[model samples]
Target: LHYPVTRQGEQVDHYFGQAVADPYRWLEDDRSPETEAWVKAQNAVTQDYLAQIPYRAAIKEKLAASWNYAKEGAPFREGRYHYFFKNDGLQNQNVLWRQQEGKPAEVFLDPNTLSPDGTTALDQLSFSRDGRILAYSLSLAGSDWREIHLMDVESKQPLETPLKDVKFSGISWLGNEGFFYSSYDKPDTDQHKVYFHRLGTAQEDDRLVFGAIPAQHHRYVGATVTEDDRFLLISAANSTSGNRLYVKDLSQENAPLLTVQGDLDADVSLVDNKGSTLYLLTNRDAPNRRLVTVDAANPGPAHWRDLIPERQQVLTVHSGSGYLFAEYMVDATARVEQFDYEGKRVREVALPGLGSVSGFNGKHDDPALYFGFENYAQPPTLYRFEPKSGAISLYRASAAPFKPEDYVSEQRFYQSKDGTRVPLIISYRKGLKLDGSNPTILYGYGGFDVSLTPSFSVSVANWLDLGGVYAVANLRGGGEYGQAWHLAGTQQNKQNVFDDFIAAAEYLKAEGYTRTDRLAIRGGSNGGLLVGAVMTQRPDLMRVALPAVGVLDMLRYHTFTAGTGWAYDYGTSADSEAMFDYLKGYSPLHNVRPGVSYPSTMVTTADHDDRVVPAHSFKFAATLQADNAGPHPQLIRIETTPVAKLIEQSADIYAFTLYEMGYRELPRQP
Candidate 1:
C-alpha cells in the first residue's frame, strides 16, 4: 500500500539546546486547505487498502447484527415520571424515555432526530430538583465543546435562550431559577470557570461564581448542587491527578464559601450531606480512598473525621435508597457492601458473579436503587435493590446476539520487569486451544488513574466471535488498586507502564496463547502512547499496531488543547532539561529509525478531535512512513462521526488485523 506524498518542511525547534526536526509540521495546520487535502488523500489510500479485504463489508454486517438489540439504562424517578435511556436495535444514539407511574413509556428526547446522520449526541442531561425543567448538552461530530439547552419537561419545548461554550461541565440546578456550569476561553483556554445561568437569561448574561482570579485559574472546574439542594459543591483541578473542593451554603443568602480542601494533592468528592455536615469520599492521606465527614462551619482536613477508614482494596462509594453503598475493587473485580449514613456496615450487596458494577446513584430518601453488572462474556444485567431488606430483583437483562456460555474469561497474574505482580484478563471461545497460532488482540491503557474494568463491547465480541483471543492487562498507573498504584506509573516512572504491558504480551506468548506474528496490540489516547511506545521499543512483540488519537509528540504535547492538563501523568518537556531528555528518549515520532522494520501500523485520528488534536497522529504517521524500511503498510485512518464511518473503521481494523495474522478472509461467523 502506498501513502500520500506528505510534504515535509525543514521545520526545526530546539529544546534545552537540543535540535529537534519537525519535518511534517505543515500537517499541524488543521484549518488549512492543504491539510484537508492531505487528510482526504490519506483517507483514500486507507479506504482502498481496507476495500481489498474481501470480508470487510461482511464484518461490518456481522457487527451491525450483533449490535441490533434493545438496550436500556437503569430507570430513575423524577417528579411524577420515571426516566431512562433506551436504544432500539442499532440506533446511533439512545432515546430518553419518560413514563408516569402507570402510564406507557414515551420518548422524551430522540438524539437520532437531532442530527440527520445521528452525529450530534446528547452529552449531558440534568433535571432540576423540582423536575419541572430539564437541561441537556449536545456535542456535534463527537467534539468536546457542547451547547446546553433547556426544555420544559411537561411540554418538551426548548427554552428561548441557550447556553454556549460549555465544556467539561455538568449542569447542576441550584433551584428552578438557575443552574451552574463550567466553561473555558480560547487563547487562555485553561481558565475553566464556573458560571451561573438564570432560567430566562442568555449565555452572555451568565455571571461567574468562581475561578475569576488568575491564581484560581484551574484547568478543570465543575459545580454540583446537592440532591437536597442545601449545598453547592465546586471542584477545581489543574491536572487529572488531584482536585480542590469548596462548598457553599444554598440556604443562606450571601453566605461565605467554606473551604473543604485547599490543596490539589488528592481527590475529595461529596457523597451526600446532612444539614451543616458533609459526607465526603476522599483520597487524602488514604491511598485506597475512604469516607469521611466534616462540619460546614469548619470543613478542613484538620476537622475531618473518618467515617470509613481506608481498606486494602480501592473503595468507590455510591449513595442512594437513603443509605451509602461501598463498591470495592479487589483485584479489579467488584465486591459491593452496603453501609448506613452513620458509617455502619449493613450487609453485603449480593452480585451475580465476578464482574463490574455501576449505576447505583439517586436521591438520599429513595427506598430502592438500581445497578448494572457485566463481564467480558456476560452482557449487562440491571437489578433493583431494596436497601431496607437487602433484597435484589433483576430489572432488565441484555438480549445480545451471542451466547455467554460459549466463551470463557479467566484472570491471571504476571510479573513485570520490576517484579511487580499485574493482573491480566484473557477471554476467548470455551474450547480454544493454547496454541501460538491463535490470533490475539491485547488491549491496555495504563495512565491517568483510569481503570479498565471487565465490560462488554460490541467490537470485542465481534473479535471473539471471529475466533480471536482478547486480553486486557491491568497495568500500573490505573486506579484499580489505589493512588499508590496510579502514581507508580506516572512522570519519570512512565516507562513502567510500557514494561507492564510488554510483560503481559510476553506472558501470553510464553503460555502459548499467540506468537509475535499472530498477536496485535491496540489502545487509544494515553493507551495509544502505550502502543506507540511499546511497538517502537520492541517491534518483535507484535505484528500489527493500532494507535488511535495517540499522544505521540511528547516534546510539544502540552501546547495543544487541554493537553497541559495531562501533565500529571506525562511531565512537560519544558519542566527541566532532564524531563525534556526523558520525553525525547521515548517519544514515538522522535524515535522512529531510518531503516527499522516496524510493525504494520494503522494510526487513527479525527478532524474535530480538539481534545488530543489530530497533529499527534499526523506527525507520527508521517514519520513512521518516511523512516520505515518494512514491507508492511503504514496507514492512517481519519475517522468521522456518522454511524457508517465507525462501522467502516471497525471492519478495516479487524480485517487488517486478521490479514496480518495470515488469514486471507474472516472466519465464518459463529
Candidate 2:
C-alpha cells in the first residue's frame, strides 16, 4: 500500500546547547489549514487501508452486538429526587435520569440530543445547596474547554446563559444564590484561578476567590464547599502530585483564611468537616496515607491528630452517613473497612468478589450510599450500601453480551530489567492449551500515580471472545503501592516504566502464552508514550503497535496547555542539562532512527483533544512514516468521541491488528 508522504520542515530547537532537528514542526500548528489538509489526507489513506480488510465489517458488527448492553450508574439523592446515569445500548452518550419516591425514572438531561453525530460531551453535574437548581458543564468535540449551564430542577428549564471558558474546574455551591468554578484564559492556557459566580450575574463580575495573588502563584486552583456550607476550601497546586490547602469560614463575615497545609510537599485530601473539626486524609507522615483531624482555629499539620493511623496497606477514606469507609489496596486488589467518625471500628465491609470497588460518597444525612465492583470477566455490578448495618445489596447488573464463566483472570508477578518486582494480570479463555502461539495484547500506563486495578469492560471481553490474550502491567510509576513506589519511576528513572512493560511481553512469550510475531502492544495518553518508546527501542518485540493520544513530544511537552502541571511525573526538558539529555534519549519524537523497521503502527488522536494535544501524535506519526524503512504500515487515525465512537474505533484497531498478524479470518468466537 502506498502511503502519503508527509513533508518535513527545516525547523530545529537548541536544548542545553544540543540542537535537535524537528522536520515535522509545521504539523504542530493545529489551527493551520496546511495541518488540516494533512489530517484529512492521512485519515483518507488510513480508512481506505482499513476498508480493504474483508473481515473488518464482521468484526465491527460483532463488537457492536457485544457492546449493546444496558449500563447503569449508582444512584444518589439530592433535594426531592434521586439521580443516576443510564446508557441504553448504542446511545452515543449516557442520559441522566431522576425519580421521586414511587414515580418512574425519566430523562433529566440527554446529551445525545445535544449533537447530531454525538460529539458533544456532558463533562460533569453539580446541584445547588437546596438541590432546587442544577449546574453542569458541556464540552464540544471532545475538547476539555467547557461551557457551564444551569437549570431549575423541578421545571427542567434553562435558568441562565452559560458561564463560558471553564476547564479543569469544580462546581461547589456557597448557597442557593451562586457557586464557584475554576478556569484560565492565558495564551498558553496556564495560570488557573478559582472564581465565585452569582446566579444571574455576568461571568466578568465573578469574584476571584483564589490564585493570581502576589504572594502565592500556582498553576492550578480549585474551590470546594463544606457539606454544611460552614467553610470554603481552596486547593492550589503547581503540579499534579501535591497541593496547598486553605480554608475560609463562611459563617462569619470577613473571616480569616487559615492554612490547613501550607507547603505543596505531600498529597492531602479534605475528607469531610463537621462544624469546626476538619478531617484530612494525607500521605504527609506516612507514604501509605493516614486519616487525621484538626480544629478550625489551628488547622495545620502540627495541630493534626491521628484519627485512623496509617497501616501497611494504602488507605483511602471517604465520609458518608456520618461514618468513614476505608478502602485499601493489597497486591493491586481492593479491601474495604468501615469506622465511626470517632475512630471506632464498625465492621469489615463485605465485597462481592476480589476486584476493584469504588464510590461511597454522598451527603451528610444520606442513609445509604452506592459503590461498584467488577473484574476482568464479569460486567460492572452496582451495589447499594446500608451504612447503618454495613451491608450491600445489588442495585443493578450489566447486560453486556458475554459469559463471565467462559474466561478467567490471573495476577502474576514478574521481575523488570533493574531487578524490581512488578504485577501483571492476564485474562483469556480458561480451556486454552498452553502453546506459545496465542495472539496477545499487553496494555499499560505507568505514570501520574494512577492505579491499574481489576475492572470489567466490553472491549476487553470482545478481545477475549475473539480468542486473544489481554494483560495489564502495574508498573513503578503507579499509585498501586504508595508514593515511594511512585517516586521510583519519575525523572531519570522513567525508563523503569518502559522496562516493566517490555518484561510483561517477555513473560508472556516465556510462559507459552504468545510469541513476538503474535503479540501487539497498546496504551493511551501517557501509556501511549509507553508504547511509542517500547516499540521504537525494541522494534523486534511485537507485530503491532497502538498508541492513542500519547504525549510523544517529550522535549517540549511542557510548552503545551496546562502541560507544566505534569512536571512532577515528567521533569521538564529545560529543568537541567541532565534532564534534557534524559528526555531526548527516550522521547518518541526524537528517537525515531532512520532505516529501522517499527511494529505495524497505527497512532490515534482526536482533532479536539485539548488534553495532551493532537500535535504530539501529529509530529510522531509524520516522523514514523518518514523514517521507517520496513514494509509494515505506519498509519494515523484522526477521529471524534463517545460510546459509538469507542465501539467503531475498537473494531478498527482489532481489525488492523489482526490483519497485520496474518489472520485472514478471526479465530472462532467463544
Candidate 3:
C-alpha cells in the first residue's frame, strides 16, 4: 500500500521527512542508508563531479589511441574561415583551433589566455567585418550571467564596457559599427527586447524603446537588417501557434510598421525584397509555409499578396530569382524540390541519405548556395554549390578516420505509450543484427518546437566505433512531423514524451539493438527533464542515465526567475491542484526515494546556465544522494558552461569518457 501523503495544500509532508529525524541510520543500515551523513558525504564530493574525474580517467585509458582526435568546444569564425577548439589531448588546456581554409588556424585562444587565473572559462567567438573587433561572452559558476567582451582581432586587446546588463542570446554586427541582439528578462517565456548598440557607445536602454509590457509574453526570436539598411525585420511571438513580423523603418523614429490589433495566428518571415515590396514566408492561408509579398512602404497584416499557396512545404526561398525550395511529407528524409515563386517545380537537389539540411544561405541573385548536411549514420558535411558553374564541393566536414562502410541508418516508427505513432531515427554499425548485445544510446529532445534535425558530429563516432548503437527518438514534443507533434508532447500531455522515449528504448531492445542493461538514455534541457522523468518512473528500462541541464522540480520551476513562462510547455503548478498533482507524478526530484535499486545515473547542470539554474541540480543531487537506496552509483556533474550545440560539444563529454574508461557494462534487472 502507498503511504498517504499529509494533507497540506501548500506543502505535503511524507514519511521521508519523518525519516530525517534520525540522520545517522545511513551508515548502520545494511539494508540501505537513509541518513543525513550520507547526504553530507555526497555533497562533499562536489569537486569530483565538477572536474569530471571519472570520465577523464575512463577516456584516458579506454580511448588513448583516438584521444588526439577527440574534438570539443564551440564554433569560432575568423576572417573567411571557421575554427574549432577541443579540450582533450593536451596539458594546460591549450586546445588549438583547426581552420577550414587551407591556412592552419593560429593559436587564437588557449586555456591560459581563455581562462585567466587558471580556471576554465572561454567563449566561442567571431570577429566583426574587416576583422577589427571580436565579441564573446565569458561565464562563471554560481551565477546565471555572462560577461560580454570585445577584443582586438589581432592583438586581443580588451575593450572597456564589456556590455553589461544584457542577457545576450547572440550578437550580429551591422557594418562593424553597430550590432543587433535580443534577450528576455526570464526563461520559459519569449518576452524579450531587441536592441542595437554602437560599437563604443553606451548600451541601449529599455527606456528609449517601449517599457516592459504588463503581460511580458512576446519574444523577439530573431532580427535582420534589410539590404538598403533602411528597414529592419523582426520575428516576435505571443503564443506557440505563430509569430508576427514587424518592419521598423530606420528613416522614421524607428517605430513598427505593422500592428497586430487582434488575434490572428500567422508566421510572417521576410523572404526577399522587390523594389519596395518585401517577400515573406507565411502560413496565412496554408497549413504549410508559403511565400507572400507586402509593400515595405505600406506594411499591413491584411494588405499582403500570397505568392505561393499551401499543398507543398516551402523549405527556403531565393528572393531575387523567385526560386523556392519545397518538399513533400512523403519524403521527410529527402529534400527533393526546387520551385519558382509561381509554385512551379523547377528541379530537385541531390542528397545521399535521409537527413536534414541546415545553414541554408545564398545571395538572392547569385543562385549559389551553402548548407550543412547530416544523417543518423553520417557526420556533418558542409557543402557549397555554384549555380553558374554548375559545380558543388565540400567546404568543411567532420568525418572520422573510419569510413561509411561501417554504418547504416534507417528511419523507423513506433507506437508511443499513449498510442501515438512516433518517428525515430536509428543508426548502427553496418551488418548489425538483432542480437541484443549492442550497447545503445537513445537521444531525444521533445520540447520548445525544436526538431532534432540530422547534423553531423564527430563525437557520435565514439559510439559506433565502439560497436555501440545510437538512436534519436522523435517524440511527441518536437516539430519533426509538424506542430501537431509538438502539441502532443507538451503541457498536460507531457507524459507522452516520456512514454515516447520509453517506446523507442523498448523498440530498440525488442529489435535486438540493445537489451535493457546495454541501453542508456541522454538528453538535455527539456529533453533532460524527459530522461529524468523516465529515470524516476521506469528505471527498469535504462542502465545509464544522462540528464544534462535538466528541469526536475516542476512544482517550483515556474516560481523562479523566468520560470512562470514555461507554464505553456508545462502547465502552471500554481493554476490548480490537478496540475500540481499531475506534475508531481513525474517530477524527477520529488520521486527519488531512499531504497530503490536503479541504474547508474549522471545528473548534469551548468552553474552559469542562465537558462536553467544550477541550484536545481544541486538540490536534485542532494536529494538523490539522500533518498536513493540503489547499489548503482548516482553521480551528478555540474558543468559550468554554455549549452552544447551537439552531443559532442558538451564540455563534460561524459558519454565519450564513460565508454572510453572501460566501465563494465551492467545489465538491467528485469
Candidate 4:
C-alpha cells in the first residue's frame, strides 16, 4: 500500500558539537493545519489498509462481544448512599450510580452527556465530610488537562461553574464551604500551584495555598486533606519519585506551614494522623518503604520514629475502619496484612487469588472495607473485608465472557543481557501447543519506577481467545524490587531496559511459545520507547511491532509539557556530552537505518495526548517510512476519543498484527 507523502524540513540541532537532522520537526506543531492535514492523510492510508484485511472485522466483533457484558465497579458508601460506577458494556463512559437503604440504584452523573463521542472521562471525585456537597474533575477529550466541577449531591444541582485549566490535581474538601486543589497557570506549563477555592467565590479570587515560584519551583504540586479535616498536607515534586512535604494546621486560621521534608530525596506520604502525631509512609532510609510516626510540631526526617519497619518487599499502606492495611508486592503479587495504630500486626488478610489488589481506603469509623482483585485468567472481582471478624467475602464478581479454567498463567524468571535475573509471567490457553507456532505479544514498561503487575485486559483476553499467547516482563527500570531496580534502568543504564525486553522476546522463542515470525512486541508511553528502541536495534526479532504513544525522540523529550519531570529516567540531550551520546545511541527516531528490512509496524498515538506528545510518534513513523527498506507495511493509527480508544485501538492493532503475520484467516476459539 502506498503511504501518504509527509513533507520533510531542513531542521537540524547541534548536540555537544554534533549536528543531528530532524526532518519531520514540522509535524510537532499539533495545532497547525499542516499537521492536521498530515494526520488526516495518514489515517486515511491506515484505515484503507485495514479495510483490505479479511479477518480484521471478525477480531473487532469478537472483541466487542467480549466487551458487551455489564461491568461493575466496587461500591463505596458516601453519606447515606452506597455509590458505585457501572456500564452495560459497549458504552464509552461508565455512569455513576447511587443507592439508598433498600432502594434500587439511580444514575448520579452521566458523563456521556459531557462531550461528544466518548464524552468526558472522569478524573477525580471528592466529597465533603457530610457528603452533601461534591467536587469532581474531568478530561473533556482525553487530554491531561482537567476541569473541576461542583454539585449539590442531594439535589443533584450544579453548585458552581467548573474550574478551568486544571491538570494533575485532586480536590480535597475543607469542611463544607471550600476545598483545596492544584493546577498550573497554563495547560502546558509545569508551574503547578495549589489553591483554596471557597464556595460562592470567583476562581480569580481563589487564595494561593502553595507552589509559589521563585521560592519553590517544583513541577508537580498536590494538596490532600486529612479525614478529620484538621490538617492539610502539601506534596511538591520536580520529578516523579521523590517529593518535599509541608503541612498546615487547618484547625487554626492562618496556621504557619511547617516543613516535614525540605528535600526531594525520598517518596513520602502523610498516612493517617492521630491528633498531633503524624504517620508517614516513606522510602527515605528504607528503599522498600516503611511507616513512621512524627509529631506535627517537630515533623522532620530526624524526628521520625519507626512505626512499621520495611520488609523484603515493596510496602504500601492504606487505612480503613481505624486499622492500617499494609500491602506488599512479593514478585509483583499482592500480599496484605492488617495492623493497628500501635504498629502491631493484627492479622494476615488472606487473599482470594494471585493478582494485584487495590482499596482499603475510607473514613476511620467506617464499618466495611473492600478490595479489587484480578489476574491474567480472571476478571476483576471485588471482595469485602470485615475488620471486626477478619472475614473476606465476595462483594461483586466480573461478568466478562471468559472461562478461567480454560486459561492459565505461570510465573517464570529469565536472565537479562548482563545475566541479571528478571521476573516474567506467561499466560495462555491451558493446552497451548509448545511447537512455537502461536502468535505472541511480549509487553513491558521499564521506566518511572512503575511496576507492570498482572491485570486482566479485554484485548489480552481477546488475543488469547484468538489462540494467542501473552507475556509480561518485570524489567529493571520498574519499582518491582524498589528504587534500586528503577535506577538500574535509568541514564547510561537505560540500555538495560531494551536488553531486558529483547531477552524476553528471545525467552518466548527459546521456550517454544512462539518463533520470530509469530511474535509481536508492544508497550505504551515509556514502554512505547522500549518497543521502538528494541525493534530498531533488532529488526529481525519479531514479525510485527506496536509502539503506542511512545517517547521515540528522546533527545528533546524534556522540552515537552512536564517532560522535564521525567529527567530521573531519561537524562536529556542537553544534560551533558556523554548523556547526549547515550540517549542518541538508542533513540528510536535517530536509530532508524536505511536499507534495513524492518518488521510490519503500527505506531499509535492520540490527537489530544498532552503527555508524551504525539510528536515523538509522528517523527518516528515518518523517519521509518522514509528509511525502511522492508516490504512490510509501515502504518500509524492516530486516535481521537479517549474512552472508546481502548476497544477500537486494540481491535485495529491486533487485527493488523494478525493480518500481517501471513494469515488471511484467524483460528477459532473454544
Q: In model 3, which regions exceed 4 Å deviation?
A: 1-40, 43-58, 61-225, 228-267, 283-288, 310-322, 326-336, 341-343, 365-367, 388-391, 397-402, 592-596, 606-610, 613-631, 637-670
Q: Which stretches of candidate 2 lie over 4 Å from their true place?
A: 5-48, 90-93, 108-259, 262-268, 274-276, 553-568, 571-577, 589-597, 606-631, 638-645
Best by lDDT: 4
- Say which prediction, candidate 3 or candidate 4, comes out ahead on TM-score: 4
CA error at residue 317 for candidate 3, angstroms: 4.8
lDDT of each: 0.88, 0.88, 0.61, 0.89
Candidate 4 has an lDDT of 0.89
TM-score for all models, in order of appearance: 0.84, 0.82, 0.67, 0.84
- lDDT, residue 219, model 4: 90
lDDT of 3 at 160: 51
Candidate 1, residue 71: Cα displacement in angstroms equals 1.8
In candidate 3, where is summed lDDT lowest over 10 consecutive residues? 1-10
TM-score of 2: 0.82
The digit string of per-residue lDDT tens for model 4 on 1-670 reads: 8888989899999998999999999998877899888888899999999999888878877777776688888787888998999998767789999999999889998888877776678889998888888899998765898888899999999989988888889899888878988878832266889998898988888888888656776899999888898889999999877999999988898998999999989999889799888899999989888999998887989999999998889899999898998999988889999999988999999997778998888679878898899888788888898997899999888888888889988898999889999999999888998899999999999988898888998789989988899999999899898878999999999999999999989999999999999999999999999999998999999999999899999998888976888898999999899999999999999999999999999999987578789999998999899999989999898886343556788889888988888877886642
When summed lDDT is taken over every stretch of 10 residues in candidate 2, the lowest stretch is 183-192
Q: Native-vs-model 3 lDDT?
A: 0.61
Query: What's model 2's lDDT at 44?
Result: 93
Q: How many clashes does the backbone of model 4 have?
A: 0
Q: Clashes in each model (backbone N, CA, C under 3 Å)? A: 0, 0, 7, 0
